[model samples]
Target: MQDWLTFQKKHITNTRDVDCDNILSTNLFHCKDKNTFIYSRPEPVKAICKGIIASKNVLTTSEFYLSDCNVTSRPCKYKLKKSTNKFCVTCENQAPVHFVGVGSC
Candidate 1:
């Protein structure tokens, strides 16, 4: 399993020069192996919510919790809201989601 906390620390340092605005366009990732890079960029916040909803696991009362949304370190929150008879989590309207994994950070 990936040591998310350790990797998260390295991710912050490795992508210091890249901002969330241009994060997707840049190849900034720190992994145990340098050969991997594609999964480096974290999924967008909306995308995360969509996936969560698609999986049918997140309940209506479930909180929109995220461990590390981005390297920018800008404060963001994911709140659940209903629209068009459906529910999803939105992150402050302009923040990218983190590449979170299972288990505690």
Candidate 2:
């Protein structure tokens, strides 16, 4: 399993540069094998409430990931894309939905 704590450390104190305007914040990711680094871009705080309403799984409520959603250092694959509905995370406002069920979570 991925060491979330280690990821947390790398992401929080990553030497890579992350800003409010770019997509790729750092090239330091947990899945080093894939040549990708953890993404730790700050959430669009302005869209926090809307993001929550759109999907109760942003980084806060749940460690939900969007390649561009930032907050990396975890094990997951996502790629940020544009949206129109304002509440959609996937293509055509459709987002990736996963339900671990009672036994999984």
Candidate 3:
């Protein structure tokens, strides 16, 4: 539904200068994700559902630019670990419902 889309699907920072820790506020504390962000928009990610069926899920034929928040030290410092890679998604009933988080495809 729209909850997954607006929740983790629409935080775009151009300069890759966003705080990684800030991604996990009290609202999403249970997610417990220590990681990077997709540099693209929801539309492109949705395209993955229509891409080639590599398995139960569809895989993006093209890679996407990612801004990985590299964690270092005890203070939870973040570094821009940028990379271009493909991602897989879970599409059931013709909807991209879950991000498999397999930044490698």
Candidate 4:
């Protein structure tokens, strides 16, 4: 079926780093938008599962340090943006298993 968000899982995690240019530039895909990174622990976000279950996607109540990446005009060439925002994500097994997107800091 659809797997775009599945790709987003690659970027979702409990910890992150500041070296985006060198790391994010690795570009995991054949085109732009190689990956993304978040600098928040999974528990807070995962709490959404307990706070409200049965819903697949929802916005987190808190902000996460966000690192997003994409390529320029060529492969393997990318720029990373550092920011913070509430994540739009999905839950499975009381944990965030998919990242839909982001919102304001």
Candidate 5:
């Protein structure tokens, strides 16, 4: 659990519940209303949610690894794509970017 404190600096990242192992990282906290602990990064005090499509079963702080794209520029939004699924940022002038995630239909 102590090993998960370090944050993985990357542009695009995704973490699965299955990959998480930190039980007491500052980034992971409990929500009284929801009654379920949420996994957050940087600062847990801030009200922000970054979702991972695949697995969705993580429970610890997983380091960010190198990826082809960077999803950190904006918050992630999920969508249903035919059979597979895509997760990425929806922007204004720039085109929509697609990142990999849990491809469950």
Candidate 6:
């Protein structure tokens, strides 16, 4: 019986009853209730999505990396804008950006 409880907690991430779609990392917590809308805090505290970055492979912390490209000879700068599915580039191919986060070593 004790082993079953432990197993349930460990494998909850793979179960349908736990709802793993909105999960970011493995950390989970009980949330407060809302009267009108169903509100639940997202994992990573700020990221409410899982999206892709095209045409870029590396992400730097420098502001130089975030600038948009204006030159026709070189690739356009990639911007990590909100609510967008595409990158701001003049190239004919899709960009491939790397996925990086805080506390990554």
Give candidate 3's whole-model lDDT.
0.56
Clashing pairs for model 2 are 28-37, 28-38, 29-37, 29-38
List model 5 lDDT by residue over 33-93, tens digit each.
1111122243331111234333222222332322222123233311211221222222212
The RMSD of every model to the true structure, in order and in angstroms, is 14.9, 12.4, 4.1, 4.3, 16.3, 19.5
Q: lDDT tens string, model 2, 1-105?
A: 222333333323222333422323344453332222223332232223342333333333333222223334544443333221122221111222321111112
Candidate 2 stretches with Cα past 4 Å from truth are 13-27, 30-105
lDDT of 3 by residue, 62-81 (tens): 77777776556534455557
Which lDDT values do the candidates have, in the order given?
Answer: 0.28, 0.29, 0.56, 0.60, 0.23, 0.22
- Top-down lDDT ranking: 4, 3, 2, 1, 5, 6
TM-score of each: 0.18, 0.18, 0.63, 0.64, 0.18, 0.15
**Which candidate number maximizes TM-score?**
4
What's model 2's lDDT at 55? 34
Model 1 residue 50 distance off true place after TM-score fit, in angstroms: 28
Overall local distance difference test of candidate 2: 0.29
lDDT of 1 by residue, 49-76 (tens): 4434222222223333222223233322
Q: After superposition, how far is residue 74 of candidate 1 from its true place, in Å?
A: 25
- Local error of candidate 2 at residue 27 (angstroms): 7.1
**Candidate 6 wrong stretches, greater than 4 Å:** 12-18, 28-105
Q: Better model by TM-score, 1 or 3?
A: 3
TM for candidate 4 is 0.64
Candidate 4 regions exceeding 4 Å error are: 1-9, 12-32, 51-55
Candidate 4 minimal-lDDT segment of 10 residues: 1-10
Using lDDT, give the best candidate's number: 4
Backbone steric clashes in candidate 5, count? 11
The 10 consecutive residues of candidate 3 with the worst lDDT sum are 24-33
